[PDB]
């Protein structure tokens, strides 16, 4: 299948014990795609002083259209030193490897895979 429903577990920047997927934007956007598959990813929800706690290269998820069984469409956009790679809509948060921390909330989305 071309997408796949997911529900992101949400979780608070300062419980997330895995602060990025690794050390370049093909390999963030790789170790993402395999940890969505695999229900090891969670969303953390961008605000003012969320990023500077996180490491780069980010992977955002982004609206790729305006939301079928109320999963909203998402793309994987990855972005190092003010780059992105990728375009796509706004950003519903920034992905980070799901280790066990407690969500506060569930994003449900379809993914472009």
């Not at 014990?17 to 370049?24: A, H, M």
């Given at each position: 299948k071309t997408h796949v429903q997911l529900s992101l577990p949400v979780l608070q920047v300062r419980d997330v014990?895995?602060?990025?997927?690794?050390?370049?934007v093909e390999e963030v956007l790789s170790e993402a795609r395999q940890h969505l598959k695999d229900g090891t990813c969670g969303l953390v929800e961008v605000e003012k002083g969320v990023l500077p706690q996180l490491e780069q290269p980010y992977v955002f998820i982004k609206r790729s259209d305006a939301a079928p069984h109320g999963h909203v469409m998402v793309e994987l956009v990855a972005e190092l030193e003010g780059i992105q790679y990728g375009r796509s809509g706004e950003t519903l948060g920034v992905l980070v490897p799901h280790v066990g921390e407690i969500p506060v909330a569930y994003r449900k989305v379809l993914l472009r895979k």
């Open positions: 014990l895995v602060r990025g997927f690794g050390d370049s």
